[model samples]
Target: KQITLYTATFSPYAHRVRIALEEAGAEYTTYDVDILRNMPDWFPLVNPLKKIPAMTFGGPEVPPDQPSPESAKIAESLAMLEFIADLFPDAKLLPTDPVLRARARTFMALYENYVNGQFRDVWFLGTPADPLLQALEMLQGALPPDGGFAAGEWSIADAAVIPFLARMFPYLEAGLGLYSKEDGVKMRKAMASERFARIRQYVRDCRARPSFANTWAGDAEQVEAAKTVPMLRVGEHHHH
Candidate 1:
């Protein structure tokens, strides 16, 4: 099987596919495109929408036991994630249990919605902390005391949300001035709090994974860029 990933250097959404691929233990090549710099004529063939992570899988058929050819001319991130999980049953990125499946989607949607809209403060004041850090606290509780993975099973919920949470670790610690420094103190304490212990460990575990190094390697570069483009003062409005 031939799989090609047309991805950006700093896209968590795109990295979701990388995590799934890594778990599946599939061999693949990555084409890390520079977003602002180039777009060759062949780009639209992978994704007419002109999006990153336009995966192209599948080639000529081999033997029955051999890998089948695949191409993703229309692979969106979420669809790509489920597609691979479905294809590789042993990977089990998507569970067979109905409730677990629902939770997986729910958490992915939560990140898309919560991280994108719900947490989007008009003033970019980080409104999740509006109610005494309720938003950030949800992250802590989301890890689950039941252990293993969120949503009651080992699935993609953690993969979908982990990168976003990980990105903030440095900002809160360094007080990059994106959000209020006072809030940074609270943020640091909140994450380090006993209640957040699971979340911390979860983040550490994910970061240690090979998939993280494979796909999300640009994080440090993003953090450095954030240093100059602070949200409230000099942070990049869009770190990724």
Candidate 2:
């Protein structure tokens, strides 16, 4: 089955799937969509929701923009991660032990449920930094105290999270969000301080992975890409 992933370098959602693909060593085609700016018309055929991180599986190979109808169009980044795991069991995206598998699922759910909202609200909505940092602190507490991945081994859970957390550092450093400079400085300090040392190491551990190295747009480049997002640019003059 040929695999094709629709992606945007700036998108954490799309990056999640890309990391899983790299981990699986899957041979796939990635077609970049400027999903923030000018998305192509054909993208909706692959995902009616017109979102990036959609995938086509098990159909004849074709150019990414010209997706094959015979292929199964799969949307949702988490679903694609699971699908990639299902397709490449040897990659062990989830552990075989029932409890460990549950851990991976739980960790991912925790991020989606408790943490993702904070990042989105803080970055996209210019919400206060206190809650975001607090949510992050709670998420940090979920990691193994001795230091390792969410499930004791690198799993799709790491893939699901690092994109956002990883982006957060550079994005904060670049002053790329709608948040005030005061809040930005506060977040940077909180993230670098002892309060977040564990999750910082977790970020480093995930960043060290070959899959992440391959899939990530460099920190500078990603921040640059994020700057183009219209929402982030809102209140640009007022940011200071």
Candidate 3:
């Protein structure tokens, strides 16, 4: 019964998996796949898409009682998080109520379709269309009035979105000269507003989690090294 994750440093997607694994208290090994270089042979064999953050469990049948030699492969950050949650039901990342569960899905969809897309447009591609401002506006409007969690206490949706936002802030600081600093400051202030305070606090709490602290803080050197290279292309094998 072996669990191995193939991933790269500085990947928010891989970071998602790390959060889930940490929250679930799952033990596993990580294989750093250098995205700046070509795909490794072992990655294609496991994931076919050769994507980082690929997981493998149980291969070549050892014993039935010992975590079964079952192997499951998944890509996409959100999917991987949900899979981990489902695999470890005791962790209870998803809500038990159907309506709350729907709410979680809605938040995730909004984050992916609007927030993430806008962040990519603004930061990664040098689009000067003020997408971050638009995204911040959307978040402010959608945020709940009561101070709780995103969909309640630490749902999978929160886990999925917060880390990306955490990383986005640093990128925003580095790329500030390209955009209006006043606007960025205003947006961060709005994010800290009472309505959005839970999320802000959650981000802080997540950073202190052992899994995040261990994986990220421990890998600071590697992460710093990764920043030197621009535009890492991690292979995601797509099957026809």
Best by lDDT: 2
Ranking by lDDT: 2, 1, 3
Taken over the whole model, the C-alpha lDDT of each candidate is 0.64, 0.89, 0.63
- The parts of candidate 3 lying over 4 Å away from their true place are 60-70, 176-199, 218-226, 232-240
The alpha-carbon deviation from the true structure for residue 193 of candidate 2, after best TM-score superposition, in angstroms, is 0.8
Output the number of the TM-score-best candidate.
Answer: 2
User: What would the C-alpha RMSD of candidate 3 be, to one decimal place?
Assistant: 6.8
For 1-240, candidate 3 gives per-residue lDDT tens digits of 566666676666787787778787887777777755666654565666756667766565432122222566556778878877887888888888888888788888888888887765554444544466567557645546455556776777767776677775554444332334555565556566674565566667666667667657443454464454455222211111
Each candidate's TM vs. the true structure?
0.75, 0.96, 0.77
Which pairs of residues collide in candidate 3? 49-237, 58-69
- Scored against the true structure, residue 162 in model 1 reaches a CA lDDT of 70
Lowest summed-lDDT stretch of 10 residues in model 1? 61-70
For residues 4-66, write the lDDT of model 1, one tens digit per residue: 777664565677777878877877777765543566666666677877777777765332123
Evaluated against the true structure, the overall lDDT of model 1 is 0.64
Output the TM-score of candidate 3: 0.77
Candidate with more favorable, higher lDDT: 1 or 3: 1
What lDDT score is found at residue 43 in candidate 2?
Answer: 87
